């Protein structure tokens, strides 16, 4: 049991891939966010969503699929 | 710990961390997982965030005490 | 004249919560992330406690063992506005309790839900639920929310701490 | 009830912005951004304080109003005396819904109501409102 579980959710419709999802510092102060270009629930609506903590803070539409 | 190991998000509802040849820290998920990320998310040097093929999010924090 | 150990993760508010407990004059001004260790004193109503300010950074957490012996109480600050590391705080509490020293000594323990001001924070009952304050039954604990800038909430905390260390 | 005035700022425990809302009956309520259960343990006390205060007040008021009810009932038998009536306010609003063809009458009283008669002189349909919790008795 080496992997301490933190959060398990199922309503977050996050259909990203292993390459369009990256975490880094985005406002300094040593608080890393995670930015992901998420597709539509099917792949119709490209939406950029960033995650801080485990609550969604900003999702905004994107021209085309990242 | 200088551990730089490749992961694997298998379709049988599990994820197994792979070093050169050995398996370790294999985990389970309620559904097969399509994307995994390991880094300093939040404020922990050992965060791993994983997204289910059906949606949802699973965030796991690795303890530092690894006839 | 009692030795107390203040505990908290990285950037959880330890230096600023022991700083706001110092008197008016001797109170410092600037707070910086700490390194290694230090010594600090603060006067309660009827007693005077001493803490060892120590960095809550990951690789600088083992040192917490050194001071387990002299401790008579445990102050445990937790960023109530930090929903991610809550499980890390739970595990740190668990691995601090079951230590051979503190597993049975029956010492009072006060948890500080720091940053009560932020709008991304939890109430005391919620953080108590998510922190498993029930898995302990050998020590009388107490969790209190307190923003460590306006100085509100620390007084009643140390008051309960002393009124429990006496009785 | 019916809100009659709204303001921002802070009135309690400075350092947390809140909304002050004046209620029709007079209950000047606030909506704060600060948690309420800020402390707990193995087992708040302000609930107990407010409970005790309301206890004492209701005891003494019951004493006074019971004695006054006795005096009023025993003095009601006085022949020449007259029994005056407590006046009160009913903020009614006989508007006309445009999306439908149905007026929506709305009575309000500072206290709570016991029963409302609806007598008419016109063939009228009294429909049902989900928000209403009253019973009907045609
Ligand atoms: N808004 C707000 N910020 C706070 C509060 N308490 C602390 N902070 C901020 O976050 C920090 C809290 O103190 P910390 O620096 O975490 O205390 P510390 O002992 O140095 O913590 P470590 O560096 O992990 O050892 C300070 O730098 C303040 O900027 C609080 O109650 N409210």
TrEMBL record, chain D:
<comment type="function">
    <text>The BBSome complex is thought to function as a coat complex required for sorting of specific membrane proteins to the primary cilia. The BBSome complex is required for ciliogenesis but is dispensable for centriolar satellite function.</text>
</comment>
<protein>
    <recommendedName>
        <fullName>Bardet-Biedl syndrome 7 protein homolog</fullName>
    </recommendedName>
</protein>
<comment type="subunit">
    <text>Part of BBSome complex.</text>
</comment>
<feature type="coiled-coil region">
    <location>
        <begin position="44"/>
        <end position="71"/>
    </location>
</feature>
């Amino acid at each position: 049991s080496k992997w301490l579980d933190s959060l398990s959710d199922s309503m977050a419709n996050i259909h990203t891939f292993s390459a369009c999802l990256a975490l880094a510092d985005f406002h300094g102060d040593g608080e890393y966010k995670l930015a992901m270009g998420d597709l539509g629930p099917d792949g119709r609506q490209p939406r950029l969503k960033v995650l801080k903590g485990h609550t969604l803070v900003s999702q905004k539409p994107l021209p085309d699929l990242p | 710990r200088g551990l730089q190991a490749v992961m694997a998000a298998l379709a049988n509802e599990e994820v197994r961390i792979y070093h050169d040849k050995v398996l370790l820290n294999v985990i389970r998920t309620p559904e097969a997982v399509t994307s995994l990320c390991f880094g300093r998310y939040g404020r922990e040097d050992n965060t791993l965030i994983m997204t289910t093929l059906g949606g949802g999010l699973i965030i796991k924090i690795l303890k530092r005490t690894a006839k | 004249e009692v030795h107390v150990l203040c505990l908290g993760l990285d950037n959880s508010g330890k230096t600023t919560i022991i700083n706001k407990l110092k008197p008016s004059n001797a109170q410092s001004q600037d707070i910086v992330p700490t390194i290694g260790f230090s010594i600090q004193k603060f006067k309660s109503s009827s007693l005077s406690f001493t803490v060892f300010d120590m960095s809550g950074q990951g690789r600088y957490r083992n040192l917490w063992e050194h001071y387990y012996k002299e401790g008579q109480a445990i102050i445990f600050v937790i960023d109530s506005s930090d929903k991610l590391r809550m499980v890390v705080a739970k595990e740190e509490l668990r691995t601090l309790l079951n230590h051979p020293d503190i597993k049975h000594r029956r010492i009072p323990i006060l948890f500080f839900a720091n940053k009560m001001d932020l709008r991304d924070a939890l109430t005391s009952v919620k953080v108590s639920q998510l922190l498993c304050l029930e898995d302990i039954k050998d020590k009388p604990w107490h969790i209190c929310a307190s923003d460590a800038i306006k100085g509100e909430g620390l007084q009643e905390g140390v008051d309960w701490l002393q009124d429990q260390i006496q009785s | 009830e019916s809100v009659t005035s709204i303001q921002g700022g802070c009135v309690g425990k400075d350092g947390y912005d809140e909304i002050v809302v004046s209620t029709y009956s007079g209950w000047i309520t606030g909506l704060t951004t600060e948690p309420v259960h800020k402390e707990s343990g193995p087992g708040n006390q302000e609930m107990q304080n407010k409970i005790s205060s309301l206890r004492s007040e209701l005891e003494q008021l019951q004493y006074k109003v019971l004695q006054e009810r006795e005096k009023y009932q025993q003095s009601s038998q006085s022949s020449k005396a007259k029994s005056a009536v407590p006046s009160f306010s009913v903020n009614d609003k006989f508007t006309l819904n445009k999306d439908d063809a149905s007026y929506s009458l709305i009575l309000e009283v500072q206290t709570a109501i016991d029963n409302v008669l609806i007598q008419s002189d016109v063939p009228i349909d009294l429909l049902d409102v989900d928000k209403n919790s009253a019973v009907v008795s045609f």
